[PDB]
Symmetry: C3
Subunit: 101 residues, 3 copies
């Protein structure tokens, strides 16, 4: 699976190793080995979420086929980033094997 996290938290305000712990959490939540989970974190962006520029984060999850998981990812992200659930949005994307290189 591929996880992409955009956030407007400055890079020097994000917990060190977030990408590694999010990788481990997604492995458990999605039932996959950690070495098949890929995580990309992009901090320091300019973001409006639900029309507000308050601190927020967007998570995208892509996997083969169609994939609550949302509840578990909210749990982890609220704890790591101190963001309320109202400041986080999650999207899921299906892939087909021909798209993998």
């Amino acid at each position: 699976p591929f996880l992409e996290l955009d956030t407007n938290l400055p890079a020097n305000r994000v917990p060190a190793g977030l990408e590694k712990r999010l990788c481990a959490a997604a492995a458990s939540i999605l039932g996959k080995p950690a070495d098949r989970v890929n995580v990309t974190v992009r901090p320091g962006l300019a973001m409006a979420l639900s029309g507000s520029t308050e601190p927020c984060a967007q998570l995208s999850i892509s996997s083969i086929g169609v994939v609550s998981h949302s509840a578990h990812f909210f749990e982890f992200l609220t704890k790591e980033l101190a963001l309320g659930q109202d400041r986080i949005l999650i999207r899921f994307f299906p892939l087909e094997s021909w798209q993998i290189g």
Copy 2:
């Protein structure tokens, strides 16, 4: 709606409050309430657009039910071009827009 804007303009050359004004613009253009509009701006990137590295921007727009036909998208893009060329001081030829329909189940 979800709007994602990549640009090679430095952050200091992106006008303050752009993400908020693009929010209101997208709500009017797409016919969605502002509290459902999400904007992500990623400045300072390294970009080539149409083979040139001069200042440029790429905008991606994703939404349920509204960006699924050429007739719909031609109408939306005209309004988004007029807004971005004014805000970013870029020529129309330096901006590319892509539309992605979302299916309802994809929202977590």
Copy 3:
């Protein structure tokens, strides 16, 4: 075509002009005029790839309008380009292909 490259290499360690050379390389590999090739490079990110945070890169390729043989050859040549330019092992690079139709282009 649209190429987007995410990497956790700090911007200062990405070779200068990478986006120009990737543009030219992609035109040759994908068989498209260079003026139809768009490249976006996002460096300095935080990434875990195959469970490791060692330097890595992800390349996404979207084209308007492949065979298994075609995309297999494209992937191999993009691996060759990225390992040379970024000094990464092949195990530190992932590639994804995405479909696009003309009605999606403004």
